[PDB]
């Protein structure tokens, strides 16, 4: 899977995982429907917790999303924000970045994620492997080989990050 994804021929497409959340909510509450705990001796009925489960799962399922795409076509594409049907965000460069983000806990453990920054864009969260830095900018160079725009790092400019298009 290391090779196949980086070339990302022309456009890339993207989706969301909230449909998974809605599906597991529906499954769990459907389990909750039939033969729940019998706590009439507790002088109460707990059906409204799964009723709020109905409400939450039905809303989370309603967040449908067709294939979030851009004009990342390996050309002079404007990186206009594209959705099947409607279009919202347009911009001549200078907005679509790729940035490394860091998070820390009370102990101090560092977790690293990636985000394709822009006007209401989609992130680049890698698949559940962030303890070390590994190579960092090699995938950034591969994105550059795609359609070079930026490869931003943490904090300010300083060093250790590369820019390609600038608005001055």
């Amino acid at each position: 899977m290391c090779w196949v994804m980086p070339p990302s021929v022309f456009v890339l497409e993207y989706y969301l995982d909230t449909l998974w959340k809605g599906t597991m909510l529906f499954i769990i509450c459907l389990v909750f429907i039939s033969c729940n705990v019998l706590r009439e001796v507790k002088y109460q009925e707990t059906w409204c917790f799964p009723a709020y489960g109905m409400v939450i799962g039905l809303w989370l399922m309603l967040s449908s999303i067709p294939q979030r795409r851009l004009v990342l076509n390996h050309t002079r594409g404007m990186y206009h924000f594209s959705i099947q049907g409607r279009t919202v965000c347009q911009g001549p460069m200078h907005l679509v970045y790729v940035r490394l983000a860091l998070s820390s806990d009370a102990y101090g453990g560092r977790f690293f994620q990636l985000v394709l920054c822009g006007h209401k864009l989609e992130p680049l969260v890698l698949v559940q492997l962030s303890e070390r830095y590994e190579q960092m900018e090699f995938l950034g160079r591969h994105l550059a080989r795609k359609l070079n725009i930026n490869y931003f790092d943490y904090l300010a400019s300083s060093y250790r990050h590369v820019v390609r298009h600038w608005p001055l």
Partner: protein
Amino acid sequence: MRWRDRIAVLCFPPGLMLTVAALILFFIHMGVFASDVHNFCVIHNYDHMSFRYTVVLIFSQVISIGWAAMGSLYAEMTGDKFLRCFALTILILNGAMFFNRLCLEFLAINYREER
């Protein structure tokens, strides 16, 4: 943007909707509060009071308080005073509403059941 399209689909803009959900929680909870005082004052038909659902609607109360707070926090950075005034008013009314129902339940404590 096309609020039009904003309200169009796939989902919706940021938060908002999550703030107006607290509004309709306020609607239903003020309704059951009104029913509760109405049954406490004149008709006196305690068999059909809200004696039976007592902790689940309290959990709904606290989740609505948290929802209105989180919506205010998630909508404050728009830079517009009207949205902040909106969210803060809903938070204030929900909080006073919650304290009102807490006081009324704590008052009618001799009418439920006994341990």
